[PDB]
Structure formats: C-alpha cells, structure tokens
Amino acid sequence: SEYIRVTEDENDEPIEIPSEDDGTVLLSTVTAQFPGACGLRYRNPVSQCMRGVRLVEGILHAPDAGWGNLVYVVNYPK
Numbered sequence: 001s002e003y004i005r006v007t008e009d010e011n012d013e014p015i016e017i018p019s020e021d022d023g024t025v026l027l028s029t030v031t032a033q034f035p036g037a038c039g040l041r042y043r044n045p046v047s048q049c050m051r052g053v054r055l056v057e058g059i060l061h062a063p064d065a066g067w068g069n070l071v072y073v074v075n076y077p078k
Contacts, residue, residue: 001018001019001020001021001023002018002019002023002067003016003017003018003019004016004017004019004025004067004072005069005070005071005072006030006033006034006040006071006072006073006074007071007072007073007074008034008037008073008074008076009073010043010071010073014071014072015033017029017030017033019067023062023066023067024059024060024061024062025059025060025061025062025067026058026059026060027039027055027058027059027060028058030060030074034074036076036077037074037075037076038055038075038076038077039052039053039055039060039074039075040052040053040055040060040072040073040074040075041053041072041073041075042063042070042071042072042073043070043071043073045070050073051063053072
C-alpha cells in the first residue's frame with residue numbers, strides 16, 4: 001500500500017499514484033491521471049535501458065525488487 005511515481009516524460013516531475021493493498025497498481029489508477037495510458041516502463045538503473053512493467057488484466061505488477069522510488073513512464077498506444 002505505497003505510492004509509485006509516474007510521469008509521461010522522464011524530464012517532467014512525476015506524480016505519485018496509489019497502489020492497491022496488495023502492492024499492485026491498477027491501470028485505471030494510472031489512466032485517471034493519464035488518460036489513454038496503456039502501460040508503464042522505467043529506466044533500469046543498472047543498464048540505463050528501458051524496462052517494461054507487467055500488466056495482466058488491467059493490473060500492473062511491481063518489478064521483483066518492488067516499485068521503490070523509481071520513476072515509471074507511462075506508455076501510450078499507436
């Protein structure tokens with residue numbers, strides 16, 4: 001039951017969005033601040049490549065380590 005930081009552009013200051021009590025994040029929780037959003041990715045700090053977040057059935061799941069304080073960048077389609 002944390003907040004994760006989410007942004008639509010890595011330079012922009014992110015906003016915190018609430019997780020579920022189980023540590024997941026609903027896609028709907030994201031799309032209420034980022035309408036259109038279809039997913040998330042984040043900059044892996046060890047490789048500096050982008051890394052996708054798992055989404056199954058409208059539910060986002062944390063990286064194995066947890067969400068931490070990383071900045072999650074929203075994906076949009078097309």
